[PDB]
Amino acid sequence: HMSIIGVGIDVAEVERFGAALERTPALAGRLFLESELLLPGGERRGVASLAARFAAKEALAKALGAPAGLLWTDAEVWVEAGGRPRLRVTGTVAARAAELGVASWHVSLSHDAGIASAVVIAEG
Amino acid sequence: HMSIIGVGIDVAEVERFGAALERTPALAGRLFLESELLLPGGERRGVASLAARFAAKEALAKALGAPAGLLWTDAEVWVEAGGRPRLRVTGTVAARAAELGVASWHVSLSHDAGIASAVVIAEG
Amino acid sequence: HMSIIGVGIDVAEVERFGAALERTPALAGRLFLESELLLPGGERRGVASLAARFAAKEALAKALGAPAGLLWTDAEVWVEAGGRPRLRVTGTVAARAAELGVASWHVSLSHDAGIASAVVIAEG
Numbered sequence A, B, C: 001h002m003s004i005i006g007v008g009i010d011v012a013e014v015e016r017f018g019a020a021l022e023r024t025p026a027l028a029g030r031l032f033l034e035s036e037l038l039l040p041g042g043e044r045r046g047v048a049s050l051a052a053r054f055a056a057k058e059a060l061a062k063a064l065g066a067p068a069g070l071l072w073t074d075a076e077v078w079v080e081a082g083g084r085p086r087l088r089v090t091g092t093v094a095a096r097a098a099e100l101g102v103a104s105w106h107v108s109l110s111h112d113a114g115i116a117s118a119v120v121i122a123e124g
């Protein structure tokens, strides 16, 4: 009845992360899919919210043992109608997930007190 | 053998939370059951400890997909003889939990460096 | 198909933790096994990294309901070739783990923004 394959936690300082995006124009497009960079309404997603998604991808990597060769764009945080964040993995991340037998992904995000936090659990 | 239904994490800045309780007298009684507002000895529970319980309820909500209509007073953090915090859900929260098939609740709390953190896992 | 026995989260302020180690020479050897105090290369492990391991041990204790009589040196954070942190429990911690039926340990560590965080899940 055992099913947890890995867990990850990650914490990002929002202000630092925002500074990093502003300094290198190409960075946001390297870390995020077009869909993640937008709010449901169509406006550009804000720094704290992006920092939480960055934290989610770091946490996901940790859950998988963070091997080399994983692409940021092969993990996607998407959002249920109800508002709940979800992980979708493709390509390199999905391949690594399959090596370990991961069937289900669980994520939660928080951004408060200028830190963005994420927890991720991989189950299979 | 899969059993995780949801996870939640939440982080509350203690000082801000304390300020919010002081500003609106009715707030503490809206967020907490009489039992949560007391220490085992019978003295009033402190701000950092209440902030961690607030974080626990936010995390629990996230674990359930945070639908509308949940009452703060339908989630209760109680404490084992040994000191371990526990979640008890009733009414609206329990009903939502039943929709998703949640049988067991796991929580942990931390308050240090002026932030209160909670993680919650719903299993079934 | 239920298997989660406990979860723990803990957050340590790095600067405070470093101050505590410096103030009392004996503290590091009370909290850590010789192996934890070193980096893979053989150099002394740094404060933030030790703070995350301290957080891991606090989180592990929480996952077990933090009974009296557990030794810090009966929990060991070790490191896979790939870099992933792992928990190994012996003696008092393993005995408590056996009382609860714990078979598997899951940990993740983070140190950023001057806080070290750990999450631990005990499964069985």
Ligand SMILES: CC(C)(COP(=O)(O)OP(=O)(O)OC[C@H]1O[C@@H](n2cnc3c(N)ncnc32)[C@H](O)[C@@H]1OP(=O)(O)O)[C@@H](O)C(=O)NCCC(=O)NCCS
Residues within 6 Å of the ligand: A009, A010, A011, A057, A058, A060, A061, A062, A063, A064, A065, A066, A067, A070, A071, A072, A073, A074, A075, A093, C048, C049, C050, C052, C082, C083, C084, C085, C108, C109, C110, C111, C112
């Ligand atoms: C290893 C990595 C995850 C660390 O995360 P970070 O945000 O840079 O640093 P954090 O302080 O949050 O985490 C550091 C801790 O992660 C842990 N870690 C290191 N390597 C790891 C690995 N292979 N697997 C899981 N955890 C690992 C360690 O415990 C480390 O602390 P320690 O050295 O003191 O023990 C990061 O450097 C990395 O390689 N990220 C890859 C991201 C990626 O692949 N993304 C694309 C796909 S989504």
Ligand SMILES: CC(C)(COP(=O)(O)OP(=O)(O)OC[C@H]1O[C@@H](n2cnc3c(N)ncnc32)[C@H](O)[C@@H]1OP(=O)(O)O)[C@@H](O)C(=O)NCCC(=O)NCCS
Residues within 6 Å of the ligand: A048, A049, A050, A052, A082, A083, A084, A085, A108, A109, A110, A111, A112, B009, B010, B011, B057, B058, B060, B061, B062, B063, B064, B065, B066, B067, B070, B071, B072, B073, B074, B075, B093
């Ligand atoms: C949605 C909610 C949980 C967010 O928590 P918060 O403390 O206000 O804000 P945080 O920064 O900690 O969390 C925000 C993140 O939560 C996530 N979130 C939003 N809606 C969610 C939902 N329906 N389910 C799970 N997670 C959700 C998102 O990832 C969001 O970040 P993002 O917008 O950048 O993606 C909160 O606004 C809420 O509706 N709480 C309800 C509490 C409740 O029902 N209590 C009574 C019963 S205990």
Ligand SMILES: CC(C)(COP(=O)(O)OP(=O)(O)OC[C@H]1O[C@@H](n2cnc3c(N)ncnc32)[C@H](O)[C@@H]1OP(=O)(O)O)[C@@H](O)C(=O)NCCC(=O)NCCS
Residues within 6 Å of the ligand: B048, B049, B050, B052, B082, B083, B084, B085, B108, B109, B110, B111, B112, C009, C010, C011, C057, C058, C060, C061, C062, C063, C064, C065, C066, C067, C070, C071, C072, C073, C074, C075, C093
């Ligand atoms: C109880 C203990 C874990 C608290 O951790 P801490 O870092 O001092 O304090 P934190 O703020 O991070 O956590 C406090 C929260 O832990 C929770 N906690 C207290 N007793 C607990 C127990 N028996 N089991 C699980 N959680 C407990 C409570 O929710 C508490 O907050 P609250 O009083 O406001 O409800 C700690 O005091 C302790 O006894 N550590 C033992 C460590 C140990 O045995 N190590 C050796 C083996 S690795």
Ligand SMILES: [K+]
Residues within 6 Å of the ligand: A001, A002, A003, A004, B001, B002, B003, B004, C001, C002, C003, C004
């Ligand atoms: K299971």
Ligand SMILES: [Mg+2]
Residues within 6 Å of the ligand: A010, A011, A012, A058, C110, C111, C112
């Ligand atoms: Mg990090």
Ligand SMILES: [Mg+2]
Residues within 6 Å of the ligand: A110, A111, A112, B010, B011, B012, B058
């Ligand atoms: Mg919050």
Ligand SMILES: [Mg+2]
Residues within 6 Å of the ligand: B110, B111, B112, C010, C011, C012, C058
């Ligand atoms: Mg602590």
